[PDB]
Amino acid sequence: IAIPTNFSISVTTEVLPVSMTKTSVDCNMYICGDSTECSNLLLQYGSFCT
């Protein structure tokens, strides 16, 4: 049999993510912008952006 006669104390560092960044988007100024000619056309595509 093998039995230790001494010992050592070690400190271990481990990392793991918890959260990401929160983001938000606006369809009416991404798809069109300030163009009111295509705001009414984007209105005809339903409720994807909701």
């Binding site: 912008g33 300030d34 163009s35 009111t36």
Partner: protein, 49 residues
């Protein structure tokens, strides 16, 4: 028969349409038109080259 060929680039304009120019208005959400470049926004004095 007369065939007309058009070219629309970033070059300065030579042949251009008849429209009545107005006065420049800054710091106001307006609709602009410069060379056939209609849009919507505010106009601010620049420092770009």
């Amino acid at each position: 028969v007369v065939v007309l060929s058009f070219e629309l680039l970033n070059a300065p304009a030579t042949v251009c349409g008849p429209k009545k120019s107005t006065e420049l208005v800054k710091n106001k959400c307006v609709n602009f038109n410069f060379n056939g470049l209609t849009g919507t926004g505010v106009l601010t004095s620049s420092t770009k080259k």
